[PDB]
Amino acid sequence: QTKAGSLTIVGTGIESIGQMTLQALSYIEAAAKVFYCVIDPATEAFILTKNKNCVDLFQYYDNGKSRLNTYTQMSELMVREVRKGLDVVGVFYGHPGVFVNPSHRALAIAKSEGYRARMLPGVSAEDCLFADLCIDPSNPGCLTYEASDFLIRDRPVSIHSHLVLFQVGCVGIADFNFTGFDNNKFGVLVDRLEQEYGAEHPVVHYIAAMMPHQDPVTDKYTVAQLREPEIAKRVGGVSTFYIPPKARKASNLDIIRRLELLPAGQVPDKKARIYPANQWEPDVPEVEPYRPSDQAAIAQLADHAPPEQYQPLATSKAMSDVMTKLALDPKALADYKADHRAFAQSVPDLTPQERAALELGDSWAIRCAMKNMPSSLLDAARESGQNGFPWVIVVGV
Amino acid sequence: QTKAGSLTIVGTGIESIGQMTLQALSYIEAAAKVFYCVIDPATEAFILTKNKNCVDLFQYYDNGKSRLNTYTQMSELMVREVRKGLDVVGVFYGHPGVFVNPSHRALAIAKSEGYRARMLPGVSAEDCLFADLCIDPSNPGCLTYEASDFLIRDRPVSIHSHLVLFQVGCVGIADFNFTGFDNNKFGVLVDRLEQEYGAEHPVVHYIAAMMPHQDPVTDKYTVAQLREPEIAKRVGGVSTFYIPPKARKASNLDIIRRLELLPAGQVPDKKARIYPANQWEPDVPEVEPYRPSDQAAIAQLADHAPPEQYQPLATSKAMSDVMTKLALDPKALADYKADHRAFAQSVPDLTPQERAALELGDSWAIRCAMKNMPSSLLDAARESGQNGFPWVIVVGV
Numbered sequence: 001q002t003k004a005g006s007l008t009i010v011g012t013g014i015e016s017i018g019q020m021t022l023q024a025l026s027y028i029e030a031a032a033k034v035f036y037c038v039i040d041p042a043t044e045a046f047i048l049t050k051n052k053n054c055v056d057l058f059q060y061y062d063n064g065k066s067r068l069n070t071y072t073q074m075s076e077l078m079v080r081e082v083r084k085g086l087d088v089v090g091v092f093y094g095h096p097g098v099f100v101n102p103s104h105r106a107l108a109i110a111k112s113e114g115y116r117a118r119m120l121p122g123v124s125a126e127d128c129l130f131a132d133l134c135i136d137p138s139n140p141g142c143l144t145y146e147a148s149d150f151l152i153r154d155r156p157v158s159i160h161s162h163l164v165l166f167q168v169g170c171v172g173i174a175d176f177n178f179t180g181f182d183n184n185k186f187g188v189l190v191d192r193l194e195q196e197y198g199a200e201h202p203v204v205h206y207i208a209a210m211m212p213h214q215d216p217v218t219d220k221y222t223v224a225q226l227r228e229p230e231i232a233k234r235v236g237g238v239s240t241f242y243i244p245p246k247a248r249k250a251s252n253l254d255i256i257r258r259l260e261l262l263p264a265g266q267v268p269d270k271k272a273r274i275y276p277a278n279q280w281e282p283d284v285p286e287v288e289p290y291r292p293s294d295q296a297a298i299a300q301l302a303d304h305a306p307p308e309q310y311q312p313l314a315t316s317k318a319m320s321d322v323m324t325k326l327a328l329d330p331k332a333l334a335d336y337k338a339d340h341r342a343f344a345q346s347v348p349d350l351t352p353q354e355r356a357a358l359e360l361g362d363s364w365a366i367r368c369a370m371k372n373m374p375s376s377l378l379d380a381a382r383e384s385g386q387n388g389f390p391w392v393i394v395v396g397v
Numbered sequence: 398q399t400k401a402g403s404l405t406i407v408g409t410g411i412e413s414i415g416q417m418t419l420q421a422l423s424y425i426e427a428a429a430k431v432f433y434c435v436i437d438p439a440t441e442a443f444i445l446t447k448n449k450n451c452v453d454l455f456q457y458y459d460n461g462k463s464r465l466n467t468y469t470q471m472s473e474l475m476v477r478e479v480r481k482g483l484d485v486v487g488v489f490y491g492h493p494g495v496f497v498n499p500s501h502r503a504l505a506i507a508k509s510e511g512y513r514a515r516m517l518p519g520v521s522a523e524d525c526l527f528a529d530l531c532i533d534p535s536n537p538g539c540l541t542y543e544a545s546d547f548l549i550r551d552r553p554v555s556i557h558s559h560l561v562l563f564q565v566g567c568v569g570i571a572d573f574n575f576t577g578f579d580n581n582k583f584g585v586l587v588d589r590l591e592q593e594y595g596a597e598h599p600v601v602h603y604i605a606a607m608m609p610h611q612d613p614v615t616d617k618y619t620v621a622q623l624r625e626p627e628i629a630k631r632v633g634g635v636s637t638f639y640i641p642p643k644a645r646k647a648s649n650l651d652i653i654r655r656l657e658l659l660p661a662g663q664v665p666d667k668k669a670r671i672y673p674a675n676q677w678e679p680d681v682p683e684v685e686p687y688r689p690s691d692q693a694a695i696a697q698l699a700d701h702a703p704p705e706q707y708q709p710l711a712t713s714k715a716m717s718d719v720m721t722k723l724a725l726d727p728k729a730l731a732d733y734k735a736d737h738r739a740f741a742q743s744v745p746d747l748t749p750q751e752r753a754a755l756e757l758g759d760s761w762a763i764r765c766a767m768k769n770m771p772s773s774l775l776d777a778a779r780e781s782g783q784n785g786f787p788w789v790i791v792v793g794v
């Protein structure tokens with residue numbers, strides 16, 4: 001049925017220790033063997049306190065050694081231990097599948113040979129970028145590329161959307177050196193940005209803080225300023241560029257008609273923007289945070305009561321404790337998945353409904369047991385024909 | 398100098414409890430007041446065990462009430478408490494700035510009025526998508542849009558890169574209903590996908606697991622199949638689409654020359670792919686994981702030793718403990734930032750070098766204190782002219 005051995009690949013996030021997820025920590029602690037690739041030493045020291053059997057993958061880089069040969073070796077070290085029947089965890093900084101080769105290789109090999117294989121997501125450098133630069137990828141869309149790939153494959157830009165470029169400090173480099181990369185082809189990237197955006201358009205040099213007390217680098221330059229030797233020298237191995245839009249894109253009349261966004265009149269202007277505006281975009285006008293409509297909405301707070309169809313939390317200590325244990329104890333989760341009914345029978349202090357919900361394991365049953373559903377909602381809701389009960393959208397266009 | 402009151406906005410991730418970051422948890426526990434917007438009840442119950450003063454923001458939605466008026470109210474509830482001098486935490490599921498309006502509004506208002514304001518990144522639905530579908534945004538680039546915005550602004554697609562569309566279950570809808578959205582304009586999205594990709598191109602319906610024991614939905618359909626009523630009905634409020642590339646893009650000869658990727662010969666073919674290949678892409682041929690070059694690299698593992706310029710961890714329990722405390726205790730971090738020297742003096746058992754590094758607070762000093770730097774590296778490295786010491790790149794194109 002199920003052969004011995006598994007591979008779980010997890011992330012640490014970017015900022016030391018704090019940006020690791022609770023589940024990444026729990027799998028590191030439970031593992032028989034840990035392999036890791038991180039930048040900062042505080043995160044390294046933290047990992048070594050959590051498991052007695054760790055190996056640093058960074059020792060498999062070398063001067064003039066092809067990165068592809070290093071990545072083949074990193075992946076094989078992990079899969080060898082999986083073949084021996086061990087529960088193996090690989091750890092990469094940030095998100096372990098965002099701009100990472102050996103994680104995807106090791107997982108695909110493990111899966112093809114019939115072992116359990118999973119990647120757990122983490123916080124990427126792009127996630128940090130959205131938080132520190134105060135932008136949302138939804139407004140007005142986001143394009144993300146590797147800088148060398150961007151140039152070699154002539155990947156398209158959209159002047160109306162966000163652009164994010166990773167690896168701007170090693171344009172055209174296939175190998176490794178411990179002292180760092182000589183970024184002498186950086187001018188080729190700058191020529192492309194001049195062609196697409198113009199010499200006076202802004203580019204933001206972004207470096208997320210790796211230690212908890214440090215501030216991020218968020219330095220705006222013109223495309224032309226990147227040609228200056230003193231500025232170009234600041235771009236290194238953990239540098240990312242953000243290039244904001246040049247203009248606002250107009251609406252399509254045919255789509256406005258078919259989606260019925262009309263009172264036989266007209267919608268707002270393409271530059272009638274929702275507060276707040278993108279502060280990096282050139283010549284962006286100031287947007288009013290408290291318009292008359294905003295003021296009227298705030299005035300309604302005084303007499304507000306929860307709507308009749310709102311579903312209040314109504315659970316117990318015993319149920320909350322078991323759901324927390326399933327999220328934070330990998331051994332308990334494996335036991336539950338192997339036999340829902342046996343596991344559910346063994347949990348003390350659960351109510352009859354709570355016990356029945358765990359026996360089934362269905363999402364809607366568990367939700368039903370933990371939230372009170374009013375009669376007004378169920379009379380209008382249409383339950384059978386959950387799939388159609390989680391509706392929490394927090395943005396509008 | 399510094400007025401009373403602060404706003405910190407944090408995320409919970411997508412999968413219940415486990416995908417919260419260690420720092421998000423620590424700020425929730427330290428807060429004077431917590432405001433939250435989450436989908437699953439186990440995460441809600443968990444938050445309420447961590448702070449005694451919480452408010453559910455979901456109660457400010459209502460039937461036929463504009464989402465913009467709800468978002469104005471959500472933001473004002475948070476900022477009102479900041480103005481009173483309290484340390485306030487707002488909590489949104491996933492990443493709190495990815496497809497979220499009220500977080501960016503509240504933070505911008507707080508910052509403009511002179512209060513401390515910060516967003517901490519979290520794990521988004523797109524982060525989960527990369528992990529569960531086994532793709533990397535770097536290969537071959539990624540475009541991300543809101544589905545209604547995609548249609549109304551006629552946003553461009555690239556047939557050679559990844560495409561991700563959020564909010565495919567509420568095409569054209571500006572308001573709210575507790576029983577869910579009537580997605581009767583879904584056919585308009587399908588027409589656009591047919592125009593761009595063709596009727597037989599794959600589309601993956603993705604729903605990340607929200608509870609720890611459930612599997613994700615990863616269902617492939619043709620564009621044509623989305624017109625069938627039984628399939629269209631499965632798309633809801635937590636549905637995202639992934640559309641894989643149609644073809645491989647060729648290399649630019651001028652860039653190959655200027656980056657010097659030539660031995661007076663030729664590079665690999667545009668479909669000479671690195672293992673593993675994208676399994677969702679149509680008519681993708683099978684790629685060999687163990688080529689002769691892979692086999693030779695693995696053979697070198699037997700006689701491997703760490704290179705002479707490798708930097709081993711060399712720290713102490715006292716130093717590791719303080720760096721962990723700064724990441725996990727917001728009060729300790731604030732104390733350290735207010736007076737580096739006073740804080741550093743008060744930590745017992747630190748060595749002279751460790752103590753001096755904390756007094757300074759500079760990244761390179763702390764790194765120097767925790768890692769042994771060999772003489773071979775420093776003779777070639779060029780320290781002064783760290784910025785140019787973190788070089789850990791884990792992918793090649």
Ligand SMILES: Nc1ncnc2c1ncn2[C@@H]1O[C@H](CSCC[C@H](N)C(=O)O)[C@@H](O)[C@H]1O
Pocket residue numbers: 014092093094095096097098099100123124125126165166167168169206207208209210237238239240789790791792
């Ligand atoms: N502290 C930091 N700030 C900004 N970008 C960073 C960074 N650390 C790494 N990067 C980006 O990531 C590239 C290395 S690739 C590894 C990325 C990592 N898995 C992640 O999830 O983000 C760098 O060249 C840079 O573009």
Ligand SMILES: Nc1ncnc2c1ncn2[C@@H]1O[C@H](CSCC[C@H](N)C(=O)O)[C@@H](O)[C@H]1O
Pocket residue numbers: 392393394395411489490491492493494495496497520521522523562563564565566603604605606607634635636637
């Ligand atoms: N469990 C899930 N699986 C896939 N997509 C999801 C999801 N939950 C939310 N989404 C996506 O997010 C949209 C709501 S917008 C909020 C997104 C959230 N802040 C995040 O970081 O991901 C949904 O319409 C859907 O496109």
Ligand SMILES: O=C(O)CN(CCN(CC(=O)O)CC(=O)O)CC(=O)O
Pocket residue numbers: 156157158553554555
């Ligand atoms: O050639 C294409 O197909 C790509 N663009 C063509 C126009 N490109 C060129 C560019 O990036 O400048 C975008 C544009 O400028 O309109 C249209 C499309 O999305 O299919």
Ligand SMILES: [Mg+2]
Pocket residue numbers: 010011012013019020021024121122123
């Ligand atoms: Mg993690």
Ligand SMILES: [Mg+2]
Pocket residue numbers: 157158159
């Ligand atoms: Mg253009």
Ligand SMILES: [Mg+2]
Pocket residue numbers: 407408409410416417418421518519520
């Ligand atoms: Mg979080």
Ligand SMILES: [Mg+2]
Pocket residue numbers: 554555556
């Ligand atoms: Mg096209």
